Design a protein around this ligand. Sequence first.
Ligand SMILES: O[C@H]1[C@H](O)[C@@H](O)OC[C@H]1O
Ligand SMILES: O[C@H]1[C@H](O)[C@H](O)OC[C@H]1O
Ligand SMILES: O[C@H]1[C@H](O)[C@H](O)OC[C@H]1O
Lengths: 346, 343
Amino acid sequence: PVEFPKSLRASSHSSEGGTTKEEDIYGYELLYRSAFASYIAPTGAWNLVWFQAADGSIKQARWYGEWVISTVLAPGKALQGTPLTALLWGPQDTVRLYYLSPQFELQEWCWDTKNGADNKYDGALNAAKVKVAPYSKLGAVSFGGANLRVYYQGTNNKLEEYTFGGGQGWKKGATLPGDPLPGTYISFVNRNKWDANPPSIRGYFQTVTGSLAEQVWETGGWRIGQFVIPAAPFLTPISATVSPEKDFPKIHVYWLSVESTIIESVNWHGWKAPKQIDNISVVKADISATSFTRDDGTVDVRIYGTAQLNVLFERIFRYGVWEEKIHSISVGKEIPIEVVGVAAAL
Amino acid sequence: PVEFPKSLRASSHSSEGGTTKEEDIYGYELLYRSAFASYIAPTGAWNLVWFQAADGSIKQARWYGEWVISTVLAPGKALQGTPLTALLWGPQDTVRLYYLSPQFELQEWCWDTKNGADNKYDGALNAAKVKVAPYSKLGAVSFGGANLRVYYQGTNNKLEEYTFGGGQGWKKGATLPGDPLPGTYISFVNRNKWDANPPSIRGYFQTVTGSLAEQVWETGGWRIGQFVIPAAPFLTPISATVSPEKDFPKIHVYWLSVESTIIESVNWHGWKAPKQIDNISVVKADISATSFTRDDGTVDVRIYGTAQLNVLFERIFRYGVWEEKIHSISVGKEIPIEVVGVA
Ligand SMILES: O[C@H]1[C@H](O)[C@@H](O)OC[C@H]1O
Ligand SMILES: O[C@H]1[C@H](O)[C@H](O)OC[C@H]1O
Ligand SMILES: O[C@H]1[C@H](O)[C@H](O)OC[C@H]1O
């Protein structure tokens, strides 16, 4: 079997007090510790998840009653281990996926479906040849329709913005405040509606001290926000999502504990205390959260990431509860492996 | 600060019972979880270590009285996250480094220093365009001088051999027995001397059950060996090294425990029980062991890998003990970060 820390739970079917003996799945055509991007439709009708396959291609899992896997970028387009982040607007017919080339330049994949179209193409951002720090992660927001903002880490480790819109093409934007950890995970959200202008932008990242910190844009410019987590694991995955709950933006910020369990902080008429959403240890690797508002004003959340041993998980927050069933989305060939909980080195 | 599990030690200056509060180093120009290859001179006179920088270039740390960093492969030559494995013979004037291209093909870097030359070049293995499983690791041995064997994981997840020597050029070699875990770390050694022929080859890998297993080549072909670890962490790093002690090959096999501490098993007139060499948790990432036989007859070992938070460590086994203060080799810019143990 494979050994796993006895005090940790590897899966939903682990013993209550940790892992004893169980079977878990190795999906070996998913890149180990793949990046993830995701977007659930604002109606909740369908879901998009993007990830990197073992061969380096970028693939898409689409849910509409069932999951369907497709390939959107061939091997060689993306850095092996590329970060990923996605945009969706129109309200829900125009999709963008940002990634890095093998030369560490910003790249953009476009999917346009307005008026019944089905057009996938390389975006204009590719031509700007924007070199980023090789360990940079990526975030992005959209507002006022097709005003786009891409967030990345520059070679001097500051967070940086690239902008699109108003007939200007892609242009360098702001340098953001703060002292980001080199290689920090980053996640940016827009609290205002997709067609509204100005936006209300929040970004979450890890600082050089290990704390989690918040970027804020409102009219008047960028500043460091009030969200402060004084200590977090080194290079902890971070993902945030926002959707209005009872007409007020509800931010969910997720990161990993030292046990690699998922911690959630909610902003909704103030920040609430961080809370572990379940006690199952995921693989310490990129996660991706997305959310939408139901007709009744309540907010659903989905989180995607890597579960033991290497499977694409889906966690579901629906009608006010985290569902106990944690789904897995098969993306290729798999082998089952016995896992045993072990308390010491030998 | 950054949080670290309280029951684990992040460094040799951690508290005895785990991490409480300490300062550790982030070398951010080292690729996080870089692969490592290494070779110490058979005389012990100097050391070579290869690793991947954050920008994807392959760099070399050479110890000759002091550590000196250089670049051997420009950015763009190697897969981001490439495995690495090295050969040294002549006894010590001919170096080969194997890696993967961004298209998952076997590649070879060559460094020839015979007669005071300084020739660095791409090797002929590149022309074979050997496509491997994208998560393949790499091993290699040399014997009889320039007879070379490169080991990798084929697209069907079997371990495979490519061969060089006898004026034949690079040719496909054996398909090895066993059922390897997709993406397993692998490490191959030659128990016989670099100029001897035939070789006595051993390889170490992880199976689809999670066990660790051993490949054996003697005259007659490949067989699965007696080295069996029934359970190990998923995709545990593995590295082995061999050098003679009292005129008998002493194999050291290293892998990581469930606490990411380094476990050692020695073969020297039989296998000895696995032993934790120290109780400091490294980053669960590639390690590289190398060894030489000192002129006094004892066997020195060096292990390289990633220590908290992201530094290139050197662990030293010398005169029969592991030195307790574990130092790092700087490869670029660094930042110190406070680490706190959390339960
Ligand atoms: O595990 C053993 C092996 O079975 C034998 O053949 O040679 C010495 C060790 O490598
Ligand atoms: O980069 C552009 C892209 O070419 C697309 O046409 O729409 C707006 C931006 O995403
Ligand atoms: O691949 C060859 C290389 O081109 C050089 O001729 O030395 C022997 C082998 O490493």
